[PDB]
Design a protein around this ligand. Structure first.
Ligand SMILES: O=P([O-])(O)O[C@H]1O[C@H](COP(=O)(O)O)[C@@H](O)[C@H](O)[C@H]1O
Ligand SMILES: [Mg+2]
Length: 448
């Protein structure tokens, strides 16, 4: 077979049987053979095994003559930012995202933090690692510790006019991941009053692995917002490249609506720009982008496709409904920090609550949320759906799975590239009844 830890977009597996120090060292050796000239940036998340996996990565890179820039405990976006900022050959973030306690992984990038994915070098690395029985060499290059975050923090702060900010009260919930360290470094430069929940980094995860989409974890942020009368709340996953928003009522805001809101925020600063969006949920983003004078650009979902499209279009901003937000000046990379700075600025400048900023949009384009189906035969299930609706003659688009536009409602139905699943998204033109009846109809067809 092949090493299971090598996935479409990154390396992910149980340690020590799918990922371990020896594999990590071999990955460093193989990565050195794939990169252009230059040093390699390494960072890690709060998981207990991450430092040792990073050290093994470093040992293999340095045995292959690569200088290593160790930026320490960080978020994924810091590896991206520093790789691009320092004009490094590439970078690796050691992180387990929201996988169980016995899991870890790696996200790899080359120059300008461009992704290394299964078809752009990651399976080449896998096959090299798989065949490598060579004795470990000794280091021929050095490691430098570079924990200074100044350039990163200045970059984050450059997205807002600090003189226009109001002293909003913000709940922040790191989930014992890494986000609190960055919040605390930003706080002396911001007027906000922070209510800190699950704030200290702790790889033992006493309050659960960080995942704000789980209702149990969601409610902890919601409760803190309501109990403290906060203006809004923000929660992150463990490597904080995903951010999640709660309005002043404690209501979690579906990530779809943040794409259009953040696009408007960015277009206010970079007028007329292009905005890249995914095909799962679309109508609200297209309308909000156009109303703000921007140009919406449809793109297949997944960070590699989004980033490539943004580069080829010089797009100012890209956003996915799955809580990933990409910014041109940020090495075209995703940040879990830039979005809440922009939203805080919007609330401060407009005098409108986060709830009011999105309320009418949610009524105008209600969506199902992403619903996942594990079925016996994905292809036959999709066919059952398309056969059922054929006589209505929807407009069909195959950018990413199947999108079907019926006029007052549409759906997208995809196979996941990270899991063996079918994913469904439905939205309507202001019609919650149609939304429910069509979602339930498709669900029944899929399960049949
Ligand atoms: O899950 P993450 O945070 O690593 O994110 C990854 O998977 C998500 C879901 O992909 P899919 O719907 O094909 O399963 C993508 O939207 C995202 O761009 C990608 O980087
Ligand atoms: Mg993440």
């Amino acid at each position: 077979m092949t090493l299971p830890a090598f996935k479409a977009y990154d390396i992910r597996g149980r340690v020590p049987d799918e990922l371990n120090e020896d594999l990590a060292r071999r990955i460093g050796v193989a990565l050195a053979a794939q990169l252009d000239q230059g040093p390699v940036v390494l960072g890690h998340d709060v998981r207990l095994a991450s430092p040792a996996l990073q050290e093994a990565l470093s040992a293999g890179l340095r045995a292959s003559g690569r200088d290593v820039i160790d930026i320490g405990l960080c978020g994924t976006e810091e590896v991206y930012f520093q790789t691009d900022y320092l004009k490094a050959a590439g970078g690796v973030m050691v992180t387990a995202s929201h996988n169980p306690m016995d899991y870890n992984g790696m996200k790899l990038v080359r120059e300008q933090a461009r992704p290394i994915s299964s078809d752009t070098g990651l399976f080449a690395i896998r096959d090299t690692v798989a065949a490598d029985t060579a004795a470990p060499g000794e280091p021929t290059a050095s490691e430098q510790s570079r924990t200074d975050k100044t350039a990163y923090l200045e970059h984050l702060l450059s997205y807002v006019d600090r003189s226009t900010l109001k002293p909003l009260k913000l709940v922040v919930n790191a989930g014992n991941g890494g986000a609190g360290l960055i919040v605390d470094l930003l706080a002396p430069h911001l007027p906000f009053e922070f209510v800190r929940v699950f704030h200290e980094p702790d790889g033992n995860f006493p309050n659960g692995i960080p995942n704000p989409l789980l209702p149990e974890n969601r409610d902890a942020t919601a409760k803190a917002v309501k109990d403290n009368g906060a203006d809004f709340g923000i929660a992150w996953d463990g490597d904080f490249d995903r951010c999640f928003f709660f309005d002043h009522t404690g209501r979690f805001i579906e990530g779809y609506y943040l794409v259009g809101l953040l696009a408007q925020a960015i277009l206010a600063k970079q007028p007329g720009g292009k905005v890249v969006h995914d095909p799962r949920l679309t109508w609200n983003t297209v309308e909000q982008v156009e109303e703000a004078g921007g140009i919406p650009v449809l793109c297949k979902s997944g960070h590699a496709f989004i980033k490539e499209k943004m580069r080829s279009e010089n797009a100012v901003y890209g956003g996915e409904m799955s809580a990933h937000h990409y910014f041109r000046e940020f090495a075209y990379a995703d940040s879990g920090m830039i979005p809440w700075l922009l939203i805080a600025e919007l609330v401060s400048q407009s005098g409108r609550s986060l709830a009011d900023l999105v309320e009418a949009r949610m009524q105008k384009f209600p969506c199902s949320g992403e619903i996942n189906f594990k079925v016996a035969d994905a292809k036959a299930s999709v066919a059952r759906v398309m056969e059922h609706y054929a006589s209505l003659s929807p407009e069909l688009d195959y950018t990413d799975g199947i999108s079907a536009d019926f006029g007052q409602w549409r759906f997208n139905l995809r196979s996941s590239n990270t899991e063996p699943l079918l994913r469904l998204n439905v939205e309507t033109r202001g019609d919650a009844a149609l939304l429910e009846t069509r979602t339930q109809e498709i669900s029944n067809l899929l399960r049949g």
